[PDB]
Structure formats: structure tokens, C-alpha cells
Amino acid sequence: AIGEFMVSLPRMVYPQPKVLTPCRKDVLVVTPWLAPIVWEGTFNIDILNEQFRLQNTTIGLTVFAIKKYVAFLKLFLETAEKHFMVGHRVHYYVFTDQPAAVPRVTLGTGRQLSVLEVRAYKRWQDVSMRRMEMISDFRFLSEVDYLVCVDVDMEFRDHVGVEILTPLFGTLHPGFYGSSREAFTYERRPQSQAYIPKDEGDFYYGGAFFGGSVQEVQRLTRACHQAMMVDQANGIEAVWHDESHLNKYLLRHKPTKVLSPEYLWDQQLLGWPAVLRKLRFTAVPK
Amino acid sequence: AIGEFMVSLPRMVYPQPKVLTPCRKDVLVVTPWLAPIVWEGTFNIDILNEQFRLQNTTIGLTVFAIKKYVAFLKLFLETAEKHFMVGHRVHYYVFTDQPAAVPRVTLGTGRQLSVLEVRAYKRWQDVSMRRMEMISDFCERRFLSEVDYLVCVDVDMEFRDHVGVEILTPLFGTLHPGFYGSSREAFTYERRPQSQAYIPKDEGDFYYGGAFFGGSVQEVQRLTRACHQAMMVDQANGIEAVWHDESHLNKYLLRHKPTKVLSPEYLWDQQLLGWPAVLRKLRFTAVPK
Ligand SMILES: O=c1[nH]c(=O)n([C@@H]2O[C@H](COP(=O)(O)OP(=O)(O)O)[C@@H](O)[C@H]2O)cc1-c1ccccc1
Ligand SMILES: O=c1[nH]c(=O)n([C@@H]2O[C@H](COP(=O)(O)OP(=O)(O)O)[C@@H](O)[C@H]2O)cc1-c1ccccc1
Ligand SMILES: CCCCCCCCO[C@@H]1O[C@H](CO)[C@H](O)[C@H](O)[C@H]1O[C@@H]1O[C@@H](C)[C@@H](O)[C@@H](O)[C@@H]1O
Ligand SMILES: CCCCCCCCO[C@@H]1O[C@H](CO)[C@H](O)[C@H](O)[C@H]1O[C@@H]1O[C@@H](C)[C@@H](O)[C@@H](O)[C@@H]1O
Ligand SMILES: [Mn+2]
Ligand SMILES: [Mn+2]
């Protein structure tokens, strides 16, 4: 459940946080609306695990594996088992047009998988974009506390845990975390619902990893889908599809945490910069 | 109200946050449980003002002015009018044994004051400690219906710069000005295991000041009730914590991590501690007494 109040922790022994000696001096670790930006070295996972275990938190993870992308499921699920929310209750929701093609993956205790059969759109943009509709229409409200929504063409390489959980989060796109807002590939046509002008924008968030409480994720995905439908009626398709709309949404509804690109990376394209102490969730070659 | 969901903001023009060039590199700006530590430069007050105005946020500010401490009210209130939550709904709650002694102070629109008549304890320790009981009692009697957040402070203070909605969150504490740079073994926690407020030398995140804490009404109700109950247990065991209510506040916040922590910009004594470079603003400061 998501607790209504602060929980009470047991005695714990860990290093004292030092007010005058911050660990991360190389990156921004809080947004101007006072949401934390999650990097290695900013959190004590022992404290956070206690907080979330005491609420018996259940996390849902949605992933789409339509047409040839079913091939990515084996590695995605096997690595999630090693690295995603270990110790907490996890419900995987695998959306696919080929239920029989879902690999049998052995799950740890307290983890479950549901296979949701869905339509395969012809245009890859429509598959990517129509995730918003499918997530928004999809039982989660009675089953999980948080939803995490990710691409399938990925693997976990390192810890991704309850440090990310919060009412609404987006993830810094790995291609643009160091870029100025004028360079962001936001939709720039005022005719699109995803329009963001050159003098606005905080971050460029990646469409491949967002989430929050079930209620907030439902609102986000419903709003993105609606905006896409308006665009479609107006004869326009945003430059980066679902991601463009995600960015418009998070511009106007500020996320309560932002994840660093540790959580969404492509080592082939981008290497392993000093600023990334861990590479947690990374692109698989395709 | 406290809105159930994220609010939708209008178009705003402001400097872009830069991921690779943080403004504050000199201080910790987030706790290990991912609560912001609020320092000048960490927040854009225009964004926060929008978020909180859109929810028509009402902030209650409690202050005790028992016996001779009514003398502090005029400066406290006049300065609060200049600096505290300006632009938002505010409700001051003055707990006093002398209602007729509360100074007439002209208030801005959307701001009001209630005088709460309470008993005066003989021992200064009890006056300080019984604030927890009194706040908790009034949470049920008044605060839950009247305000969204409560901010609970000492009266022997004045506002000297902005104190606003950047502090609002479910539960917050404030880094005590005497110890923000100290190691946990130098914190003056209650060190006697017999006390409910006991914290051993190998525990503790911060030393929080008893003079400035707050949160949602429901969290403040829980904190103040818990602290009073701990103090009653101590009393029945014939023990009184070294720093009274502050000792219990520290025990409470160790075990119930605050969702924001305020830097000592929000609780300072300039005569005693000067003005270190790390403090770019002095917002709420001790009055000589
Ligand atoms: O045929 C698909 N089936 C499918 O299930 N997807 C889902 O959409 C996500 C986004 O598409 P990606 O190819 O991973 O997009 P990028 O990461 O921007 O390259 C995939 O991870 C996957 O979960 C995506 C595709 C697809 C196939 C070809 C081109 C674009 C998208
Ligand atoms: O006579 C009092 N009346 C009163 O209302 N108070 C309230 O308790 C608060 C804390 O006591 P302080 O004297 O400010 O304590 P310190 O900040 O530790 O000096 C005061 O701000 C005030 O709000 C405190 C006192 C008091 C009087 C003498 C000694 C200690 C406390
Ligand atoms: C420094 C600026 C110039 C260099 C920018 C380098 C990263 C570009 O990234 C693409 O960015 C697009 C938006 O502009 C979309 O999000 C696209 O899905 C993404 O590529 C996806 O994610 C990438 C990380 C790769 O995994 C790529 O194969 C994917 O197709
Ligand atoms: C570096 C360590 C050694 C030096 C520590 C210097 C500050 C000490 O501070 C006192 O600390 C106590 C707890 O240990 C209580 O909170 C007390 O109320 C407080 O004094 C109150 O607040 C102070 C800021 C002053 O305003 C003082 O006049 C007050 O009585
Ligand atoms: Mn992808
Ligand atoms: Mn005082």
C-alpha cells in the first residue's frame, strides 16, 4: 500500500550525512521545484528499503513486446530478476501480440508476471505511441501501488530499486542531459499539442522510463493519449511521438523525482562518462 | 487544500536548471532518504508559488507567548507579515495566558489571527515541553479544519528574509544553527538509555532545532502527540530529557525521517554565531533576550 503517514524505522547504523561535505558536487541533485535527481551517492538504499518494505510496497512494471520485440523479453526479465526492486513485491505486466512467445522465466519469491494480449499496430510509431492508451486503460489500480513503464529493448545491469518511487517521475534522456533547452528535440510546431517553445523546458525526459503512483501514471498516460488523438485529428504527428507528449506533460506537471541517466543509458552510443558511476538500465543492440 | 494530484502550471519563463553545473556545491542539498535540504539557490520560488497557490494552500503558524514572552509578539508578527508566506493564506495561532496582551497588528489580505487561551506552567521547562501537548490538542480541535500545513516556532525571534512555500511538505525539521557542521557524537541528544529520547553515539542524521518544525496537520499531529507521550513516559520514570521537547523532537525525526529539512538559514542566532559564507540569507533569527 502507499502509506498515508511517515513510518517508524528501527535502529540503524550507517555513515552520518555530512552537511558541509556533499558526495556529489559534479551534478545537480535537486530540481528547482525541490524534487531529488537520483544519482549514485545521493541515497542510502538501506534507509529507503526499510521505508518501503514497512509499507509492503507492490511495484508494477509494464513492458511492451509486440511483433519481433518479443525476442528482447528473455534478457529483460532475467536481468530484472537480478536488479529490479529485489526484496519487494513485483508484478510484471507484459503486453504482447504473441502470448505463446513469452519466454518462461523463473521468478524469485513475491514476484509475478501477467501476460496481456494486445493489438499489433503496423507503424512502429503507432506501437510506440499507443502504449500510452494501453497503459491508461489498464486493473493496476486494484493490484499495485506504483507503476514503472519502460522499453523492452533493454537490460538491467545494476540496482534499480525503491529510490525511484514517488508520485510521479521522469528520467533524463541520455542523449541530452548536458544540453541547453534550445537544443532539446521538443515538438516545436505550435499546431501540435506537444508544442514547447524555445524559452521553456527544464529537461529532456526519455520516453523509455517513467512512472509514479498508479493514479499519477494513469493521469499522465491518459493525458498523453488524448493529446496525441487531438494531433491526429489535426493532421499532425509529434516529432518524437509519445516522448514529445511526455515532455509537454512533465513540463507542466513537475515530477516529484527525476532519475539520472544511470537509469536509461546506451553504452554503444554514449560510452561510460565519468558522471555515471553506475549503468543501471541500458539499451540492447538492435 | 492539499491537492490529491500533481497540479498543471501555466507557461513560465525562467533560467534552465543545468544538470552539469549545480549552483550549491558547498553544502549537502539532499538527505540520504532523498529529502531536499532547503538552502538559497536550490529552489525557484516562482515555480513553487504557482504550485502552492493553485491548491489555495493555507498555512498555520503556531507560537507560544506565555507569561513575559508576550513582549516578543509585536516584532514576531510584524516581521512575519513582511516575510512569511506572503501571497498565500496564513492563519496565526497565538497560544497565550494573556489574551488582552496580544498586540494589535494589522494584517494583509487573506491572513488572520486566532488567540488561544491556555494555562501558564510555573517551570520554564514545562512551558516549553507542554507546547507539544497543546499543539496536538488543537490539531483535533481547530487545525485539521482550518489549515493545510502547520509551522511551529519559537516566539523570541524575528523574520528577516523570505520564509515561504519552499518549506512545505508532509514533515520537516530544521538544522539547529549550533550543530549543522558537527559530527553526530557532538550532537547534544539525550544520552541516557533510561529516557524515551535516548539516542546512542552511533546513531543520528542531524541535530534538529526545537524552535522550527512543521508539516501537514496530520503529520504534525502525530509528531506532537508522540513527543508528548514520550515526555509523559519519561515523567513517570522520573526523568527529564537534557533539552526537553527538542530532545524528543530529535528522537522522533530520527525514526520518522522528515520529507524536507530546512537549512540554518531558517533558524539562526547572529549575535552568537555570526554570518558564515554558507548562509547566503538569514531568514528567521533570534531576538536578544
Ligand atoms: O515493433 C515494435 N514492437 C514493440 O513492442 N515496441 C515497443 O516500443 C518500444 C519503443 O520502441 P524502440 O524501438 O525501443 O524505440 P527507441 O528506443 O526509440 O529506438 C520498444 O522497446 C518496445 O517495448 C517497439 C516496436 C518498434 C519496431 C520498429 C520500430 C519502432 C518500434
Ligand atoms: O516564559 C516562557 N514563555 C514562553 O511562552 N515560552 C515559549 O517557549 C519558547 C521556547 O523558550 P525559549 O526561551 O525561547 O528557549 P530557547 O530558545 O532555548 O532560549 C519561547 O519561544 C516561547 O515561545 C518560553 C518561556 C521561557 C521562559 C524562561 C525560560 C525558558 C522558557
Ligand atoms: C547530443 C545530441 C545529439 C546526440 C543524441 C544521441 C541520442 C539520440 O537518441 C534518440 O533521441 C531521440 C530524441 O532526440 C529519441 O528519444 C530517440 O528514441 C533516441 O534514440 C533511442 O535512444 C538512444 C539512446 C539509442 O539507444 C537509440 O538507438 C534509440 O533509438
Ligand atoms: C558547536 C556546539 C557548541 C556550540 C553550540 C552553540 C548553540 C547552542 O544553542 C543551544 O543549543 C541547545 C542544545 O545543545 C538548545 O537547543 C538551546 O536551546 C540552544 O540555545 C538557544 O538557541 C541558541 C542558538 C541561542 O539563540 C540561545 O540563546 C538559545 O537559548
Ligand atoms: Mn528502446
Ligand atoms: Mn527561543
Residue numbers in the entry:
A (entry chain B): 58 to 195, 199 to 346
B (entry chain A): 58 to 346
Excerpt from the paper describing this PDB structure:
One important example is the biosynthesis of human ABO blood group antigens, which is the most important blood group system in transfusion and transplantation. GTA catalyzes the transfer of GalNAc from UDP-GalNAc to the H antigen acceptor (HAA) (α-l-Fuc-(1→2)-β-d-Gal-O-R, where R is glycolipid or glycoprotein) to form the A antigen, whereas GTB catalyzes the transfer of Gal from UDP-Gal to the HAA to form the B antigen. Among these is the enzyme AAGlyB, a dual-specificity GT, which can bind and utilize either UDP-Gal or UDP-GalNAc with equal efficiency. Each letter corresponds to one critical residue in increasing order such that the AAGlyB chimer would correspond to GTA-L266G/G268A.
In the AAGlyB-2 and AAGlyB-2-HAA complexes where the 5-substituent of the donor analogue is a phenyl group, the electron density is well defined throughout most of the only chain in the AAGlyB-2 structure and chain A and B in the AAGlyB-2-HAA structure. In the AAGlyB-2-HAA structure, upon binding of the acceptor, the internal loop also goes from a disordered state in the “donor-only” complex to an ordered closed conformation with Trp-181 stacking to the phenyl substituent of 2. However, compared with the AAGlyB-1-HAA complex the internal loop of the B chain of AAGlyB-2-HAA is slightly less ordered, and residues 196–198 are missing entirely. Furthermore, in the AAGlyB-2-HAA structure the C terminus of both chain A and B in the asymmetric unit does not fold over the binding site in the same way as seen in chain A of the AAGlyB-1-HAA complex and is only visible until residue 346. Therefore, the reason for the destabilization of the C terminus and of the internal loop in chain B in the presence of 2 is likely the lack of hydrogen bonding to Val-351, of the type observed for the formylthienyl substituent in 1. Finally, as for the AAGlyB-1 structure, the AAGlyB-2 shows well defined density for the galactose in the tucked under conformation, whereas in the AAGlyB-2-HAA structure the galactose is not visible except for a few blobs extending out from the nucleotide β-phosphate. This suggests that, although our enzyme kinetics results show a lower turnover number for compound 2 compared with compound 1, and although the C terminus seems to be incapable of folding over the active site, the enzyme is still slowly hydrolyzing the donor derivative when soaked into the crystal. Our results suggest that this pseudo-closed conformation allows the transfer of the sugar, albeit at a slower rate than the native, closed conformation, and could therefore be the reason for the small, residual turnover observed for AAGlyB toward 1.
